[PDB]
Design a protein around this nucleic acid. Structure first.
Lengths: 887, 335
DNA sequence: AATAAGTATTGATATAAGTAATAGATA
DNA sequence: TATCTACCGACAATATCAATACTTATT
């Protein structure tokens, strides 16, 4: 039934609370079923399908794939348990000797203990599922890359074993397998799957043209040369591709992480929260061990409580699928033609007629490129259509009930929903489908905010609020037509920038228009409020810029000012002068330049035949926000210095070259909320690990790796700004959740009810103050000075000298007794560590004096971070009145 | 009588992009005696030569003074080399053109649009006796050019649309060892299979005596290549160079399916055919086992296969009812 | 007590085949 | 001073083969 309709039906709030209380109890059991593990759900579902189909009979229907999968599982299980038996037959031999030099000596003795840890049927289901998920990935046309597949299967087995161990440990009340064991285990299992998976295929012989049928392996392991360097691939048979890119794919491969039906478990520590039964970490990224190490230490201290407050308010907001929009999208989906973003069902790719072989090489090269383009588009549309169908299936399942999205953080700290497939942070259609479960009376303000919301969706957000309301009023007849006849009518909503969301709001507004008193109407539609380029607002606040702040609406103004338009105007003038100069690049491209190109280049800059545009846009933004440019320079310089620094304690004789120490220090800083941020830009070193199928070129994440200085320097400014954005979001989320608002954030925008926007707006401004009343660049420099105190930097001798305390610091010559000066002992010790010319002891100390009187030599400076740039004067507290700060 | 540039002139040229040019006229006399070009070009007074990458232009002057053709077109783009060639061969019957040999358009524009150099199309039974092409592709990085030009012989679309045009190619000794490798040797790869299927190729001269240990001993006996020192290559730094006479031959297989089969078999050039035929398609080994009635061929690694066995395997591949699509073999990187 | 042998391991090179991309100071 | 030359990072993977270190099998 439709729970949402029953909830809306109830007249009184006390009755609604009683019904919801009953609903939580009734939904607890269903939630437990939802959190069922993949191995159990997949095996039970396809086995049931096969058993039922056998009685019904054999046909190529919606469950045909499930029947095939159960057959493959049943005829692959004996292979794997025979492998386990043959592993135990020599694992109890206890004698490692001159045995079969390949099949049992090093290979089977290595992964022998790792196959036993988990029951065989689980491994079979895991390999089948993990190969089905990887269809059309990694660049392969209808398959996957073998390295990714072997690692995915081995890692899924590792995760299933460790989940079993966690469950056993809660019930009774290697650690992390190396990459080599993951690769070997995955390759061993997929080999058996390759050699039992058969599909029946048809074909017309060329010699006789007789339509002949026969069995063929469903998977094949081959290679492909890309740019002159082979990569091993696993191709999937086209007979199976027809069913992988099919409407019933969700039946075969169900989604383990779906929106929960019960309120998410509150986050109380880094490792506990979110799903009631499934156990999830507080960081989406698991590749970097250092980030998790710091996160664990911070969680242990308990200084991230504010991060939890924000995540728990973000997670405790109940949503519900928009049935009205769902029907329209379902109709369009069934129609099969290509809609605004839907590609449209295509049977097979159509290639242009091949040119004659005798044609000159350029013609053939062009044809090959065109074939590549057509194939890429076809694979793109198939992927998009499959993703859309999967999302609509999840939406259809959860149509009646209330669903919650638990959130996680990335290394920067941005919050992302735990359920990846269907969430409000996806594409326009996904956002259109979801609406807030709680309905709040619009009131006087809400009606205005709903109208301005529609105006914003249509792309007219530059104008003041009065103009936006005027636009909606002027288009009231169009709104009526769109809501009343979504597809049969003029489809005015389709012309909107965000058509699915525009349609949803059109439905809401149409309902409002039929009401004598609009304020009484209760709207579930979320209204999005956002600032124009949050990063610029932060750069202006940190810098204290006055000219820059005006463009980002920091200072109250009668008319809202958008940075994009101002920079576009300036860069337009810059191109105009460039064109007058005489370069034709500007002249040809002046007309093409539009607001979107500036919006994209500026967004990338602040968050990450023509080359004039990028330089000019950067120059214009730099001039517009000079303070921001100075801060960016300081951040980049600090990152570079930290990257070249070497820790005193970690330096020993372990280095491959005594005089060439590795750089293992990565920028680490603490968010105002206290979350630790560790830039994970290391230098990977890949190697060929040997597996059954091939030797895969994989890299070990446990292998400590020199830090990628270039990416560190290119990443401090954007990651610092992202950390500030996430801090502001989590602060405002905690506050709104305290005041009683349903707060949804999609990184750029903050969503709430139309009747709460005003309220939320206040909170937003306030929290911005509460974040920037303290000088953050200064606090960051102090934290850097503390964390990178006793480091030493390698320096060249081509530039000038900065200060006069280095010459005594490097030597550590002065007596250090009666005080703990083991740093002097330690610094000198490092020189001992550094391998100067010595067999004896004082030969590098007395040499630098000729450098201290200089002579070219790689010197050991002390790590000294620069002084923060001059902070322009701008009182951020004038923000309490800017009605266009966030809009 | 084109004036030949000596060692004095060609020492001032500072840039060569990595190309090495023999400058000894005596070695050129030995080479042009070994080739005996008047055996396949009966009337040299009517021959049209297209010299790609002429460089210092000594081979060109010697060729002209020895045979005196009807038109000698030097396609040299390099700035300093073009300057030298146009300051030394001014007024001489040579034709120095500033057009990039690498660019495909250069030939189309010159042969068809500008019509400055117009060869004679001839049948595909004998070597075109009115069109001879000379090239010095010696740069260590310009190895893909040789492979592309070999592919053109198979496709009959670049310059081999004028018949069987004979090419005189200077190339690194490692390239010549890749190409001239015989079944089972160490340097046997797909370039050698392409050479074997498309060309009849001889090693006319090599620039090192300790390089001939990488070629087939019987083939070294038949060819008898001229040996000269690195004291006659002008840029005296890089690897040795090797002259190769290349005459196209006839072939009657499907070049697309043969390209696929050969490229996918020579990946595992040490795996026996008992297990390397699954890299071709789904169920490839079952098919090629039920099909190959010579159960001994099934044991030879693709490095031991002659070209005729490769053509046999592509014939079996094209009869396969469930053969894959040889067009969708790329890696979709836009994905 | 010799003196050659083996293997376990790592580093190198070739692969395909339009050569992507920027400037850099200098001829 | 205005084109000439240099920056190989997607040889952003893998099979094969020669060279470098770790056990030995007789007298």
């Amino acid at each position: 039934i439709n729970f949402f309709e029953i909830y809306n039906s109830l007249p009184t709030l006390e009755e609604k609370k009683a019904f919801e209380s009953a609903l939580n109890i009734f939904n607890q059991d269903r939630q437990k079923v939802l959190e069922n593990r993949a191995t159990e759900a997949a095996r039970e579902r396809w086995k049931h399908d096969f058993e039922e189909a056998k009685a019904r009979g054999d046909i190529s229907i919606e469950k045909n794939l499930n029947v095939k999968l159960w057959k493959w599982y049943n005829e692959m299980l004996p292979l794997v348990k025979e492998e386990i038996n043959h592993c135990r037959s020599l694992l109890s031999e206890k004698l490692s000797d001159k045995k079969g030099l390949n099949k049992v000596d090093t290979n089977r003795l290595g992964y022998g203990p790792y196959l036993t840890l988990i029951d065989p049927g689980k491994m079979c289901v895991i390999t089948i599922l993990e190969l089905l998920k990887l269809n059309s990935t990694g660049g392969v046309i209808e398959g996957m890359r073998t390295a990714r597949a072997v690692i995915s299967v081995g890692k899924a087995i590792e995760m299933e074993f460790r989940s079993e161990q966690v469950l056993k440990s809660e019930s009774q009340a290697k650690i992390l397998w190396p990459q080599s064991i993951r690769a070997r285990i995955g390759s061993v299992l997929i080999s058996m799957l390759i050699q039992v998976a058969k599909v029946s295929v048809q074909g017309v012989d060329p010699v006789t043209k007789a339509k002949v049928h026969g069995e063929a392996p469903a998977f094949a392991h081959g290679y492909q040369y890309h740019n002159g360097s082979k990569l091993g691939v696993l191709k999937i048979h086209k007979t199976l591709i027809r069913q992988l890119n099919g409407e019933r794919l969700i039946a075969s491969v169900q989604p383990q992480l779906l929106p929960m039906l019960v309120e998410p478990k509150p986050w109380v520590n880094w490792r506990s929260g979110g799903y009631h039964y499934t156990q999830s970490t507080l960081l989406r990224t698991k590749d970097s061990p250092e980030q998790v190490a710091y996160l664990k230490a911070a969680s242990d201290n308990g200084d991230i409580d504010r991060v939890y407050d924000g995540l728990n308010v973000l997670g405790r907001t109940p949503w519900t699928v928009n049935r009205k929009v769902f029907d329209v999208v379902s109709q369009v989906w069934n129609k099969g033609e290509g809609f605004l973003d839907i590609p449209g069902a295509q049977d097979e790719m159509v290639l242009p007629p091949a040119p004659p072989k005798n044609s000159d090489p350029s013609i053939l090269r062009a044809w090959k490129l065109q074939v590549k383009t057509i194939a890429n588009k076809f694979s793109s549309d198939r992927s998009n259509r499959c993703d859309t169908n999967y999302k609509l299936e999840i939406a259809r399942a959860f149509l009646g009930e209330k669903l919650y999205f638990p959130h996680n953080l990335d290394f920067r700290g941005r919050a992302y929903p735990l359920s990846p497939h269907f969430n409000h942070l996806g594409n326009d259609m996904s956002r259109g489908l979801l609406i807030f479960w709680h309905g709040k009376k619009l009131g006087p303000s809400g009606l205005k905010w709903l109208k301005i919301h529609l105006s914003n969706l249509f792309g007219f957000d530059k104008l003041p609020l009065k103009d936006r309301v005027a636009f909606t009023e002027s288009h009231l007849q169009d709104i009526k037509d769109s809501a009343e006849n979504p597809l049969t009518g003029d489809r005015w909503w389709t012309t909107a920038d965000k058509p699915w969301q525009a349609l949803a709001t059109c439905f809401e507004l149409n309902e409002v228009m039929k009401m004598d008193n609009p304020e009484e109407f209760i709207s579930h539609q979320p209204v999005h409020q956002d600032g124009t380029c949050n990063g610029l607002q932060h750069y202006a606040a940190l810098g204290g810029d006055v000219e820059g702040a005006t463009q980002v609406n920091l200072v109250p103004s009668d008319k809202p000012q958008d940075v994009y338009a101002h920079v576009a105007r300036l860069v337009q003038k810059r191109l105009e002068i460039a064109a007058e100069k005489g370069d034709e690049n500007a002249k040809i491209l002046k007309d093409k330049i539009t607001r979107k190109v500036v919006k994209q280049t500026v967004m990338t800059n602040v968050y990450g035949f023509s080359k004039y545009l990028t330089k000019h846009v950067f120059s214009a933004i730099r001039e517009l926000f000079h303070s921001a440019h100075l801060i960016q320079d300081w951040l980049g310089e600090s990152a570079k210095r930290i990257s070249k620094s070497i820790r005193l304690d970690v330096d020993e004789k372990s280095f491959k070259n005594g005089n060439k120490p590795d750089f293992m220090s990565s920028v680490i800083w603490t968010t105002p909320l206290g979350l630790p941020i560790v830039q994970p830009y290391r230098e990977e070193s890949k190697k060929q690990v040997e597996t059954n199928l091939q030797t895969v070129f994989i890299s070990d994440p446990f292998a400590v790796n020199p830090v990628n200085a270039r990416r560190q320097k290119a990443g401090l400014p954007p990651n610092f700004i992202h950390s500030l954005d996430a801090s502001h979001m989590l602060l405002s989320a905690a506050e709104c959740g305290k005041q009683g608002l349903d707060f949804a954030s999609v990184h750029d925008s903050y969503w709430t009810h139309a009747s709460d926007i005003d309220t939320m707006n206040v909170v937003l401004r306030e929290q911005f103050i509460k974040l920037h009343e303290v000088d953050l660049v200064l606090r960051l420099k102090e934290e850097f000075d503390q964390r990178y105190k006793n480091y030493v930097k390698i320096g060249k001798l081509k530039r000038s000298t900065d200060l006069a305390q280095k010459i005594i610091r490097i030597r550590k010559d002065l007596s250090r007794k009666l005080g703990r000066s083991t740093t002097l002992a330690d610094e000198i010790y490092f020189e001992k560590k550094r391998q100067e010319l010595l067999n004896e002891d004082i030969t590098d100390l007395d040499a630098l004096e000729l450098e201290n009187g200089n002579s070219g030599m790689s010197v050991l400076l002390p790590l000294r971070l620069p002084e923060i740039p001059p902070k322009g004067d701008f009182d951020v507290t004038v923000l309490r009145n800017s009605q266009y700060f966030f809009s | 009588s084109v004036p030949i540039p000596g060692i004095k002139d060609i020492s001032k040229l500072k840039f060569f992009y990595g190309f090495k040019y023999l400058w000894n006229p005596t070695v050129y006399n030995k080479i042009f005696d070994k080739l005996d070009l008047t055996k396949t070009y009966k009337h040299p007074e009517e021959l049209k030569v297209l010299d790609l990458y002429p460089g210092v232009g000594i081979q060109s002057a010697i060729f002209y003074n020895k045979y005196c053709p009807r038109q000698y077109s030097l396609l040299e783009k390099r700035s300093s080399l073009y300057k030298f060639l146009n300051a030394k061969f001014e007024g001489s019957p040579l034709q120095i053109l500033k057009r990039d040999p690498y660019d495909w358009s250069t030939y189309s524009n010159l042969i068809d649009e500008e019509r400055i150099f117009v060869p004679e199309v001839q049948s595909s039974d004998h070597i075109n006796d009115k069109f001879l092409t000379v090239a010095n592709v010696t740069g260590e990085g310009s190895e893909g050019l040789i492979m592309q030009w070999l592919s053109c012989i198979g496709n009959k679309n670049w310059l081999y649309r004028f018949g069987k045009v004979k090419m005189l190619l200077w190339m690194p000794s490692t390239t010549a060892r890749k190409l001239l490798a015989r079944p089972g040797m160490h340097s046997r790869s797909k370039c050698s299979v392409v050479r074997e299927a498309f060309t009849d190729t001889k090693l006319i001269a090599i620039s090192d005596a300790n390089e001939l240990k990488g070629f087939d001993s019987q083939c070294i006996e038949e060819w008898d290549p001229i040996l000269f020192s690195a004291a006659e290559i002008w840029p005296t730094k890089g690897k040795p160079i090797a002259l190769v006479e290349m005459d196209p031959i006839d072939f009657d297989f499907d070049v697309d399916n043969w390209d696929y089969v050969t490229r996918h078999l020579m990946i595992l050039k040490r795996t026996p055919l008992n297990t390397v035929m699954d890299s071709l398609g789904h169920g490839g080994q079952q098919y090629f086992n039920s099909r190959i009635t010579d159960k001994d061929l099934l044991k030879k690694c693709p490095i031991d296969l002659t070209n005729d066995e490769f053509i046999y395997l592509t014939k079996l591949f094209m009869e396969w009812p469930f053969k894959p699509d040889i067009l969708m073999d790329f890696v979709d990187m836009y994905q």
